[PDB]
Each structure stands twice: as structure tokens, then as C-alpha cells.
């Protein structure tokens, strides 16, 4: 479970408000939030690696309460 | 009547409030320096005065933001607002008003047999003036042994916010050319200067 997939975001969000955002729950050890080079903008889906698995299963339970730019945030195991 | 001030023999002051219902002893603050403490005194609720076995006088004030109810080796501390070396060990500290109709002041004896006082400034004018006094006096009238004044009062801890009166009073003993020329560097007159130092003594003490 150490990693999660996160959908439905707005590009003003970046890797930092994800950092800050999910460490509110529990620390994101490895952050991945693609920067698209071609048009220089984000599609808004994320992958998160944690310290171990327990962090991330609690993360499955609590985790999908985040709302990025008035809008819904997908978090599921991976 | 509210809090309690612990004085360590080594690590100095420990602020301790007694919670009445839980009956617990609560250390919410401590000193930033080790100091060998003879005795303590309260200038006010938020300040503490203390003397060193080595004959130093420190004053440490709480920050106004202190947390009154709580639960390296500490959490929050108190800045040290004054350090002055008397050169003579002080066994008691008492705040009082020496003379009737006088201004409230601080009192320290010493082990040498001397009795002296610390006094607050009510104005920045006398402040800066006495500052220039100390300044031009030092180099223009060095201490007798050749030892420097500043270091001697900064001896264990660097001086913070203290003007030495016993140096300022030596204005009397200097030669008239010293007295005058310095007064010119001060842009005053020997009577002006002299009486103006008589001011603090008179008003506060004998």
C-alpha cells in the first residue's frame, strides 16, 4: 500500500501542497506529481511512497477526504 | 504569591508555578546560562535579579509571551537582560526605597563590606549623556592599575545596559584641563556635568 494514486487536481496545486497536504495525514517520503514538459502543465494525478505499509493503509482509510480546488481527490492503493 | 523561583547552585534559575488543584510542581522555564547563585530577588513579576558566587550581578526577564500554565534540556527560556561584574561577591539582594520621598531602587550588599545600589533611568537624555561620560572618561581617564574599566565590568559576562557610576564621579578628581576639555567634548560645563551626576545620587540616595 506504500504508494497511492491521486486523481482530479488543478495545476496551481504542485508537489509542495501535496507534500504539505498528505503529511497532514502522515509523511510522504517519496512524492511524484508529474510535470508535463510539452505544454508545461499538470494533468493532476499523483503517486505517493511512504515509510512502510501501515502509514498507507490508514492512508486508504482517512486519505480520500482531501478536496483540491473545491474539487474531489482520488486516493487508492498501489 | 503566584509563582515560585528556584535558584540552583549551578544551573541558576528555574521558574516553577504550583498548580493548586493537581498539586503538581511545574517547571515552565529556565536560564540560558549556568550561573553559581548566591541569592535571588524580584524586581517584578517577570524579572529576577541574581548574584554569583564569583561576584556577578545578572538580571533575567521573562518574555511577556510566557505560558503561565503548561505540561536542549528545556522548552522555553528567558533572555538575560543585564550582566554586570561588581568584582565583589554579593550575599543578599533587596529592592526598596532608600530615602523618604525618593525613587524606588535596587539594593545589593557585598561580602567585602561595601553597600551599593542599582538604579533605573527615567530618561534617555541622562542615559546617552552618561554614556558619553563613560566613553570619553575611559580613554581620557584610564583606571589606575592600567587595567581597563570596560573589561573589568565585563569580566565574567559582557556588560549589558549598566552605566558605572563610580567612574562617572571621578570627573571631580581630574585636573581642571581634563575636567574642562572633556566637558567641551561633552559640550557642557564642569558645574553642569558635576551637578547633573549629583542629580541621580541626590534624588535616589544620599
Amino acid at each position: 500500500d506504500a504508494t497511492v494514486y491521486v486523481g482530479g487536481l488543478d495545476e496551481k496545486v504542485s508537489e509542495p501542497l501535496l507534500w504539505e497536504l498528505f503529511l497532514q495525514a502522515g509523511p510522504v517520503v517519496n512524492t511524484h506529481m508529474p510535470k508535463d514538459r510539452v505544454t508545461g502543465q499538470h494533468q493532476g494525478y499523483g503517486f505517493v511512497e511512504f515509510l512502510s505499509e501501515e502509514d498507507a493503509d490508514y492512508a486508504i482509510k482517512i486519505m480520500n477526504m482531501i478536496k483540491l480546488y473545491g474539487k474531489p481527490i482520488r486516493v487508492n492503493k498501489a | 504569591g503566584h509563582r515560585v523561583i528556584v535558584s540552583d547552585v549551578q544551573e541558576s534559575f528555574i521558574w516553577v508555578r504550583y498548580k493548586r488543584n493537581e498539586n503538581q510542581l511545574i517547571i515552565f522555564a529556565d536560564d540560558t546560562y549556568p550561573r553559581w547563585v548566591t541569592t535571588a530577588s524580584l524586581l517584578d513579576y517577570d524579572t529576577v535579579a541574581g548574584a554569583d558566587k564569583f561576584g556577578n550581578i545578572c538580571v533575567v526577564r521573562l518574555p511577556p509571551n510566557t505560558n503561565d500554565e503548561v505540561d536542549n534540556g528545556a522548552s522555553q527560556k528567558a533572555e538575560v537582560i543585564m550582566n554586570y561584574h561588581v568584582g565583589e561577591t554579593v550575599l543578599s539582594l533587596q529592592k526598596t526605597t532608600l530615602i523618604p520621598g525618593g525613587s524606588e531602587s535596587l539594593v545589593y550588599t557585598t561580602l567585602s563590606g561595601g553597600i551599593g545600589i542599582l538604579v533605573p533611568f527615567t530618561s534617555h537624555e541622562d542615559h546617552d549623556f552618561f554614556q558619553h561620560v563613560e566613553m570619553h572618561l575611559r580613554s581620557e581617564h584610564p583606571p589606575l592599575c592600567g587595567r581597563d574599566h570596560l573589561s573589568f565590568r565585563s569580566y565574567y559576562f559582557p556588560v549589558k545596559n549598566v552605566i558605572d557610576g563610580d567612574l562617572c564621579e571621578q570627573f571631580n578628581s581630574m585636573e581642571p584641563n581634563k575636567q574642562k576639555n572633556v566637558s567641551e567634548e561633552l559640550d557642557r560645563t564642569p558645574p553642569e556635568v558635576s551637578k547633573k551626576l549629583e542629580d541621580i545620587r541626590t534624588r535616589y540616595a544620599f
Binding site: - | 547552585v9 549551578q10 549556568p34 550561573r35 553559581w36 565574567y156 559576562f157 556588560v159
Partner: protein, 130 residues
């Protein structure tokens, strides 16, 4: 901003600034901010570049006189006995610089060190109470 290092010359020159400032302001009661700056000064202690190490030396000497030895020594304690050779070389160099001057005023600030079998490491004179 400068002492936080873009490139060594920043740390060096800025450190020299801390030095001359530190001699200049002495005795006037500004020590606090000089302590804050001493924080950022402190990591630069380690390097082999002659100009930056001698610079840092001058720096910590001026900071010695301005701040007073007590705070210095409180940064220099743990480094004395640390296992590594490097750290001991340096912190002992510093501690010597602090030691030669103001050796008279250091007395109060040596902490309490417990006594072992063959030796009594507690100085009991300071614990005589009237």
C-alpha cells in the same frame, strides 16, 4: 543570506564582516542578534581552505569577545571528545583560541563532571554554602 553559502567566498567575507562587527559593537548590549548570526556561522567550522578557515578563526575570536566565553564554550564542549579525529582537531583548536584569552573567566562555566574511581572530578569548593 550571504553566510548561507552560495560559494565559499560568501561565507569567508561575510564571516570577516561578523568579526569586525563583533569587535566594534562590544559592550553595548546587542549580543542577541550576534548569537543568531553565530548560529549560521557555526557550520562553516569545517574546511581545509586556508583563507576560509583563518577567516572563521578571526570570526569566532571576535564573537568570543563580544558574546562572552560562556556561550562559545557551550558550543565547543561536545566537540572536544568526539570519536573522530577531525572534529577533535578542530574543536580543540577553537577551544584553545577560547582558552588562551579569558582563561580567568572560564572557571564558572566548566560543567559538573562526575568523579570516577581513582579520581575526584567534582570541585566541592563551589558547593560550600553559608
Amino acid at each position: 543570506d550571504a553566510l548561507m553559502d552560495r560559494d565559499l567566498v560568501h561565507r569567508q567575507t561575510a564571516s570577516a564582516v561578523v568579526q569586525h562587527m563583533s569587535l566594534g559593537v562590544y559592550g553595548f548590549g546587542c549580543e542577541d542578534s550576534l548569537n543568531h548570526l553565530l548560529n549560521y556561522v557555526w557550520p562553516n567550522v569545517f574546511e581545509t581552505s586556508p583563507h576560509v578557515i583563518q577567516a572563521v578563526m578571526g570570526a569566532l575570536e571576535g564573537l568570543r569577545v563580544a558574546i562572552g566565553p560562556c556561550r562559545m564554550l557551550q558550543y565547543c564542549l561536545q566537540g572536544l571528545f568526539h570519536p573522530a579525529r577531525k572534529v577533535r582537531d578542530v574543536y580543540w583548536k577553537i577551544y584553545n583560541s577560547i582558552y588562551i584569552g579569558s582563561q580567568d573567566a572560564l572557571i564558572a562555566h566548566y560543567p559538573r563532571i562526575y568523579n570516577d574511581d581513582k579520581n575526584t572530578y567534582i570541585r566541592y569548593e563551589l558547593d560550600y554554602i553559608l
